[PDB]
Design a protein around this nucleic acid. Structure first.
Lengths: 108, 230, 97, 23, 96, 274, 75, 79, 80, 97, 98, 93
DNA sequence: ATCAATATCCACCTGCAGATTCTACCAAAAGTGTATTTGGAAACTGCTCCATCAAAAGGCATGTTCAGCGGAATTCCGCTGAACATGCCTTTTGATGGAGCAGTTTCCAAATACACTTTTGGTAGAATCTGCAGGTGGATATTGAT
DNA sequence: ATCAATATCCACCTGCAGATTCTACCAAAAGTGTATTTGGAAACTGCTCCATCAAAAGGCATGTTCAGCGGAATTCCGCTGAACATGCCTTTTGATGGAGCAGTTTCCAAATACACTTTTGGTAGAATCTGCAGGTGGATATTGAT
């Protein structure tokens, strides 16, 4: 709509110069190709935007219109997509997968 | 947006929120089923034998016109078979027949060819008869049609009547350039419309031959069961 | 003077507590352990709350995974009581000599 | 008048059963 | 008192996914650390791969293979896709 | 259409326009028999084949018959000439295969019925004699003799129970038949509710590759057919659903003619020469 | 051609006569249980040699190509 | 001093019934607190070295959690 | 282009477990230890081929599989 | 004939392959099986035959990995043989993903 | 004269500095730190080697071979966790029997 | 077309017992051992290189790194020797 | 098995952090318009590697076996936990209290890039000895049945 | 306790690659000076935030019985560790053999560093309101007495 773009070229959603001086502050090599240094918008987006669609139903199931943390690494190791990298995430009281042995219940 | 995976569970109960006119005389007669399955190993081409029959167009000169004063009785069952033969009694020896129906080769030089020719190795059962001694009865299967208990050998159709078989077999190749009444396919192309011998296999002449000697008496316990009625 | 079959309220405790993520511990004796065992190496050292809490629950996760682990090790040997050297070799097999 | 090849042939199969396909 | 605030972008996109939806803040810092940790580790890997390739510019494509490899394959495909649709609109140094 | 097909009982106007007059471009009235089902145009060779009757059961190998029908498995390599020619019936009609090479090894399963007039050639679906990409079923056709009974849908009840002792997967191929969908999912429809009525335990969707032999790219594909994938309750829940309370009453109160896994004899072959 | 391609033709049917072994011999010994009591009746004879004949014809239609494979692989 | 019994069978009653075991060998105490303390004084000791060479004898969580991110179980969430 | 499986390979166990000090086995875990070997290694060789196609190579190298083995995380001797 | 006891001649064969360290597998079925499960998700990918040397010692590495800890699981379980949930416990003990 | 002998011990310096140049993002650093940074291999590379040779007293395998090398530095247990990560061209394992 | 390091290891070996000999699985395998312990010290340098919170780097990071990565007694006497050698480098003016 | 005592589900509701979201400044950059540099790309191109190609040795491998011992299933002594009522101890949530840690200053020790100049640590190399794996031969452990 | 056939230990002896320590050749990171750095060395200030008590109540030890559950061995069996005549792609064994290297060579896209630059996210931090973690009762799920 405008000639002045904020890199409006991406419909963009993430801060850009911040990732560029991120790129300047770990910067082991000297060069990361700059038009392809705009791919890092895909570097952020994804599973965080996957969990926000993942975390819908329980929040209304426990009748809660905003978000609280603790139901999340439970579904992470339950989420078969991310669970391979989801080992090093440990949370301040964000939980476990709780599970009871069926063999614990002797039905007596 | 993703799709499901293994290992999971299912919740079951809880709180969730004009008929064509001519087949009746064409097929009657019954098939015998066994109580078990069938092993079948005979080709469908020799179930047909020859894939050749001849329609009304030339046999309106002979079936109701020549049978009037024929000395040997002339049917149709003897004739349609013999003129189906010799196309394959000569097929080894003119694969350059292809280009011209003027190059049909006449019977006067088919005399040493087709008289002692052998139709896809035709005559294998008569030297198979002498050890089998089906000499009284006549060599019939049901893989064979029943048109051989009635029909007669190849000689005394030729050497009584042979000068009039090739004759109208000749003129009706040039109108199609030598093709058969059924041209075979579009088979000029598959196109569109319009060291091992020396170790173990030498029992191949031992483990199918160990019953060929039995095979001369696989008949004999039924070849003994015949001479009793009459 | 009436009570049900012995063992039932533990199951309730499983439900609520593995369901829970509220902590357990007084901060003080835990960090008193860390201070007694760290002041030896240099006196006058302090610490911050997220460490004691997360360290607590992380080694809880450590142990409680070990507890279920040797649970199915005991019923893997078809029993319930785990041993010491069961959890030792599991944790040895997790990476610590 | 006719039972001659009928009785003098039937010791072959028990001469055949342990002959080839028993080993 | 000298920081950056990262819950807003996911906050805006969370309401645009789920219409009136708020946040808890701890997971914000959890996953910001999580994403830049796994990002910097694949960065160090990618730079070393760009060292022992003996050629001296890090690309989109090799780290993209990294987020095809250790990122999981469905959302890896999603990653390639959304990066490519980003770049196929990253061509407009033009009028339309 | 051209040179319309008088085959057995009920005729058809042929579907793809003229691969009957490939070179056959002068006649009108075409007479088909059943056994090898030869595509005879002309008249007075065909009743001559009624003199030539030697076959009361066709060249089809047998691993099955029920009370009613019998099943055919067709090594087209022993009988060479005709065992290509049956798709030329399809090439007039179901054009979705190739005649590009006179291809040697390719496989079938055709189908028949025991009629007291004789064995009744009643159609086929396609097959491959290999192991490449699913290689069981590609093209569904219920022949223009006769369509409208249940065997009109019972072409595809055959690849899967072969896969039991075969112990690997069979998977349908890309030239689909459009009406075959109302067999395709319709066959796989009640299969999902089979181990649903029991087995409330954990299922893996390749344990139904130990139950139904289905591949991962397609066992999920038949899953979302009944959009059966509710979640955010604790797992991916199949959601036992009130509409489907019918046909696991109606599969057992309006039971339908399916087969038995025991009466069949086959063993896995060896692929040898090329 | 070679000795290697001669086995390729001579296994499959060679593995199918045992199917013919496992299919044919049974009904020879089945249609004959009732008849010795007689010792249909006068017109059933025409089939009893026919199914014997396929127990006879079934073997030499192969040898017309088969036995000459020995001669070309020995010369 | 010897406050090892801060963690004990009430403690591991909760955090061991959470394991789903029922009957511990009721002398697991010393060794579980041992491996607990091995992890902790190890991870805090090199955290302390970092930050008191950064000249600070309190410790944040980030350094100590990177040191246990060497064993990989990293807490996040407080910067 | 032999698109055939031979993966049920071997009860090599008979010294797979005499390298260690463990007694008799009788197995049948063969199939899945094959599978777990193969699945772990295919996960690491798609790594190596992605490396090699970053280098746009046809093959993976001994060096490339060294990159694989350090990056799953057990460092390899003998091969640089 | 003279026959050795079950186990103590297994003890010398324990000592025999402990006395071994050497090459395990053949080249061929391994290289082709991994070659064809790579052939699919890209048509024919070359392996350095030297790196097939690296692959043969690589599959040595996986076999020594899994068999050292299956040894140790067997000596956990009070059992002479090894089985499934041994390796299940070891794998989730081991972190497959 | 040499950065071995100016540093006075066996090893030289600046190439490993160039490796930490090719490791770098602070992009420059002091020359005088590097020799003790260079020490880290030295004061490692002792910690495993002749620790073998106590077994050399009675066997005379006077060339070092690889499966001889891993015999009792493997028993020099204080680093030994860090070398379960060490993989190796046909290394070898040893008993601990119960 | 490469450098070697094992020659330095040989002269260290003659500073130790010069007596022993060389197999070349063992020479190549000590070469790979030293190469990946070299990259190992490079790796723990990377992590300090991150969270120094610095931009131009000290030498106490070197001393503390060789203090912080490694076990008790070998690393202690290591850092003693390393300071000793660089201080005698410094005395070598 | 049919009550009655606990325990989950659930309804409706009670004083909060406190989210949060917002103005408001406000630093404070990240997008805007040039510069100078290359590393990328890639391309050319002998080649050395890898995948076959074939064949007498060929140590395992295949099915096949024979009669042993944990595994399974299964046993009573004996009880360490386990069920919670009575006794006791350190607590949590509220008040002050101080030397050390965030953030900020002046001087300095060291370092980039450069400019000179070179040894030396590096590569392919093949002599000599030799080290080592490997083959020979007598004396010493090691077990299965009687 | 004892007989007696297999398996291994140590000095001696032979092929077999080869190690190593340097000659031929190199080459390029290295040693020290000089300018100009600049963050940090190191100290100053700000003002803390990890440390100190006080009132009650709320969980733990210790119980007494018990007890559900094994702890260590019974019989069987099965299935198999140690045997085995006799196949197997495999292994040497060079050779074919051809084709993506990698190492040099060679344009340009452009990333990156340069200085400007219109606005927009860090924080100060309150309005306000507002759902929101939970107190208090109805319907009902679980579960023991005999």
């Amino acid at each position: 709509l405008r000639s002045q773009s904020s890199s409006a070229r991406a419909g963009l959603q993430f801060p850009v110069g911040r990732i560029k001086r991120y790129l300047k502050r770990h910067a082991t090599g000297r060069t990361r190709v700059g038009s392809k240094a705009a791919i890092y918008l895909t570097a952020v987006l994804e599973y965080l935007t996957a969990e926000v669609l993942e975390l819908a139903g329980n929040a209304a199931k426990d009748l809660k219109v905003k978000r609280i943390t603790p139901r999340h690494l439970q579904l992470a190791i339950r989420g078969d997509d991310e669970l391979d990298s989801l080992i090093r995430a440990t949370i301040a009281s964000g939980g476990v997968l709780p599970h009871i042995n069926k063999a614990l219940l002797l039905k007596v | 947006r993703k799709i499901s995976v293994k290992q999971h569970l299912k919740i079951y109960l809880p709180n969730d929120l004009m008929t064509w006119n001519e087949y009746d005389k064409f097929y009657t007669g019954s098939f015998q089923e066994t109580t078990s399955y069938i092993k079948f190993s005979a080709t469908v081409e020799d179930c047909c034998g020859t894939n050749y029959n001849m329609d009304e167009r030339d046999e309106t000169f002979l079936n109701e016109q020549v049978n009037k004063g024929s000395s040997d009785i002339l049917t149709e069952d003897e004739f349609e078979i013999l003129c189906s033969s010799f196309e394959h009694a000569i097929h080894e020896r003119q694969p350059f027949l292809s280009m011209d129906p003027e190059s049909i080769l006449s019977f006067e030089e088919l005399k040493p060819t087709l008289i002692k020719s052998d139709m896809a190795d035709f005559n294998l059962r008569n030297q198979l008869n002498h050890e089998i001694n089906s000499h009284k009865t006549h060599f019939i299967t049901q893989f064979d049609p029943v048109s051989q208990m009635n029909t007669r050998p190849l000689i005394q159709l030729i050497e009584k009547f042979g000068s009039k078989i090739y004759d109208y077999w000749r003129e009706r190749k040039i109108e199609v350039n030598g093709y058969e009444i059924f041209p075979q396919l579009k088979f000029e192309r598959p196109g569109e419309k319009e060291i091992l011998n020396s170790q173990r296999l030498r029992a191949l002449h031992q483990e199918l031959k160990n019953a060929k000697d039995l095979a001369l008496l696989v008949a004999k316990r039924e070849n003994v069961s015949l001479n009793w009625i009459n | 003077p009436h009570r049900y079959k012995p063992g039932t309220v533990a199951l309730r405790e499983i439900r609520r507590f593995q369901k829970s993520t509220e902590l357990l511990i007084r901060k003080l004796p835990f960090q008193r352990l860390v201070r007694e065992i760290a002041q030896d190496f240099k006196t006058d050292l302090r610490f911050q709350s997220s460490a004691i809490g997360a360290l607590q629950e992380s080694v809880e996760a450590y142990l409680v995974s070990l507890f279920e682990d040797t649970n199915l090790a005991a019923i893997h040997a078809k029993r319930v009581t785990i041993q010491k050297k069961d959890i030792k070799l599991a944790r040895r097999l997790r990476g610590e000599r | 008048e006719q039972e001659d090849t009928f009785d003098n042939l039937q010791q072959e199969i028990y001469d055949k059963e342990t002959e080839y396909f028993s080993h | 008192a000298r920081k950056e605030t990262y819950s807003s972008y996911i906050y805006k996109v969370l309401k645009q996914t789920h219409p009136d939806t708020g946040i808890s803040q701890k997971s914000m810092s959890i996953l910001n650390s999580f994403v830049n940790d796994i990002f910097e580790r694949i960065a160090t890997e990618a730079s070393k791969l760009a060292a022992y390739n003996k050629k001296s510019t890090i690309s989109a494509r090799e780290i993209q293979t990294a987020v095809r490899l250790i990122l999981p394959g469905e959302l890896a495909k999603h990653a390639v896709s959304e990066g490519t649709r980003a770049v196929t609109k990253y061509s407009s140094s033009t009028q339309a | 259409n051209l040179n319309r097909i008088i085959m057995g009982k009920y005729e058809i106007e042929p579907w793809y326009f003229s691969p009957y007059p490939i070179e056959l471009t002068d006649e009108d009235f075409i007479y088909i028999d059943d056994f090898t089902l030869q595509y005879f145009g002309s008249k007075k060779q065909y009743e001559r084949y009624r003199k030539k009757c030697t076959l009361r059961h066709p060249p089809g190998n047998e691993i099955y018959r029920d009370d009613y029908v019998s099943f055919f498995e067709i090594d087209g390599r022993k009988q060479r000439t005709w065992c290509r020619n049956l798709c030329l019936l399809s090439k007039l009609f179901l054009d979705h295969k190739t005649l590009y090479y006179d291809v040697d090894p390719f496989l079938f399963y055709c189908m028949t019925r025991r009629d007291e007039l004789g064995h009744h050639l009643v159609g086929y679906f396609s097959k491959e004699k290999e192991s490449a990409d699913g290689y069981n079923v590609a093209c569904i056709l219920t022949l223009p003799q006769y369509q409208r009974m249940g065997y009109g849908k019972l072409l595809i009840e055959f690849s899967y129970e072969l896969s039991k002792k075969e112990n690997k997967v069979g998977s349908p191929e890309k030239p689909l038949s459009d009406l075959g969908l109302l067999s395709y999912r319709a066959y796989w429809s009640d299969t999902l509710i089979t181990l649903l009525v029991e087995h409330q335990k954990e299922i893996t969707i390749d344990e139904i590759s130990s139950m139904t032999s289905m591949t991962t790219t397609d066992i999920l594909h038949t899953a979302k057919t009944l959009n059966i994938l509710r979640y955010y309750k604790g797992q991916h829940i199949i959601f036992l659903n009130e509409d489907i309370l019918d046909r696991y009453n109606r599969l057992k109160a309006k039971k339908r003619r399916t087969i038995d896994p025991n009466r069949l004899i086959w063993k896995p072959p060896v692929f040898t020469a090329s | 051609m070679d000795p290697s391609l001669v086995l390729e033709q001579t296994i499959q049917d060679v593995s199918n006569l045992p199917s013919e072994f496992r299919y044919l011999l049974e009904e020879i010994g089945s249609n004959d249980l009732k008849l010795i009591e007689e010792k249909k009746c006068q017109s059933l004879q025409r089939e009893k040699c026919v199914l014997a004949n396929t127990a006879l014809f079934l073997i030499a239609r192969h040898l017309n190509k088969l036995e000459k494979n020995i001669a070309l692989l020995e010369e | 001093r010897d406050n090892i019994q801060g963690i004990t069978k009430p403690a591991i009653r909760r955090l061991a019934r959470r394991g789903g075991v029922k009957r511990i060998s009721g002398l697991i105490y010393e060794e579980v607190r041992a491996v607990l303390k091995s992890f902790l004084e190890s991870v805090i000791r090199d955290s302390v070295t970092y930050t008191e060479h950064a000249k600070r004898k309190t410790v944040t969580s980030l350094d100590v959690v990177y040191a246990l991110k060497r064993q990989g179980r990293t807490l996040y969430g407080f910067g």
